[PDB]
């Protein structure tokens with residue numbers, strides 16, 4: 001299952017190409033400005049086989065709870081209503097979000113103790129790096 005090393009509180013330390021990723025998602029200008037300024041904390045926890053990923057920032061908080069491989073309803077930080085599935089591939093926690101015939105993926109993996117989130121939409125790729133608090 002998901003490595004226990006994912007469990008805990010993570011702080012954003014680096015964000016590359018987030019503005020173009022937000023553009024690809026249809027996020028408007030004023031929202032992108034705040035999005036690019038945000039330095040969220042991400043908290044990963046687990047109760048039995050239910051995994052929870054909570055994001056906290058001054059601008060927006062989000063939270064998803066899910067079982068691996070089972071599709072669930074999600075509300076994203078930019079207020080999309082998606083149907084999502086989180087899978088595990090070679091240690092990586094891979095989230096796919098589907099809405100209005102569109103799709104984006106967020107793959108989270110551990111690299112030398114950091115958590116790296118790769119966000120992909122229509123050929124645009126954003127990389128966000130988190131450090132364990």
Ligand SMILES: CCCCCCCCCCCCCCCC(=O)O
Nearest residue numbers: 022035038040057060077078117128
């Ligand atoms: C709380 C994150 C930024 C707030 C700005 C909200 C509007 C755009 C963000 C939508 C996509 C968020 C993807 C985050 C991926 C990650 O966990 O690093």
Ligand SMILES: [Cl-]
Nearest residue numbers: 038039057058
């Ligand atoms: Cl913030």
